[PDB]
Symmetry: D2
Subunit: 115 residues, 4 copies
């Protein structure tokens, strides 16, 4: 599993369940090409987005649909989404965990990179 996403809810103190996550890869013409997508599980985790064969080097954008998450909870979301952008595999293959902590007017994200 080369790319995992974990999402937590800072208002309820819970995993953020059934949150849509879209991954794009920067194309040669500087446009964002669809790469992978999924929904977080009951643990707030999204495994199986991609495979080692598909996950090449490049610039990736992980978009987390925070707006739908907050709307479903009847909360006024400020952010449309989170947009985590990073270069992956530039020195060779790595495993990446993108973690995000969500509040209506704030978000924090970190990455755990393992060789």
């Amino acid at each position: 599993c080369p790319l995992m996403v974990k999402v937590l809810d800072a208002v309820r103190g819970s995993p953020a369940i059934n949150v849509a996550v879209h991954v794009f890869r920067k194309a040669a013409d500087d446009t964002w090409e669809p790469f992978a997508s999924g929904k977080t599980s009951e643990s707030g985790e999204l495994h199986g987005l991609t495979t080692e064969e598909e996950f090449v080097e490049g610039i990736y954008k992980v978009e987390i649909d925070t707006k739908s998450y907050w709307k479903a909870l009847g909360i006024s979301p400020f952010h449309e989404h989170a947009e985590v952008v990073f270069t992956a595999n530039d020195s060779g293959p790595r495993r990446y965990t993108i973690a995000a902590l969500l509040s209506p007017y704030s978000y924090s994200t970190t990455a755990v990179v393992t060789n």
Copy 2:
């Protein structure tokens, strides 16, 4: 001043100085159009981005060039940029402050909306 941006460095415990900040507004065709830009001051603040007349309701993206900031300090960064995408709604007098806290492998962003 309807839109202010403040950037802090969590490694050095200091304002993030001379950081490029680009603001985009979502156009009718779903593309991101340039709206305002500047560089943070010695206090890590960016004032005078826009005016009350120009800052209408809409979907905005604030992109902070964190990659150049870390590279100039000789610290290896993970992200290309730190950001906030949000909806600006007129619900009485409002001033938006977008604050970002930077670390090489993480960032936090919050919005303070005041009257």
Copy 3:
């Protein structure tokens, strides 16, 4: 002003107003002794906690009464308080700003040290 505290609310996107803040300094016997205290203003800021003469090097603890803040808003909080424990060292002219971002089940705290 050698020590300032700023508190923000990540649920409402606003300053956290009238929040009690207590500052302690580590005594010789390893106990926490009261040092300064106050309440945040309408801007979520607390100025005038101490003076240059009183603020010596040492280990300080800033305790923010987040539990009372959330209870007054009718939101169930997790933490008793949000905090920062740090060492204050004189390395040229220094001003400390302790900023805290609050959510019911999370908080972030940072220190900005300036000249």
Copy 4:
């Protein structure tokens, strides 16, 4: 496992390994009584701190030794430690995950509470 602690390093983009974590429980005389302690693993996780039988209701303080962590990495730590304080099991037994993200001048913490 009723109480788990997970610690991440925002500078290196890694789990914070071999970080000391001390848990105290507030005693009848308002003093902090030792309750459990351990070190984070290679995954930055600390499992097996306590048992369901030992983990009664009360006010708990989770102290993370951030100072030793940063000193071992040759980084100038601002914080002495992190001090996460919360009431546990007041409505009946719950499982708690305390997560912390560390930077030299900042820290973020969240709690995941499951029934």
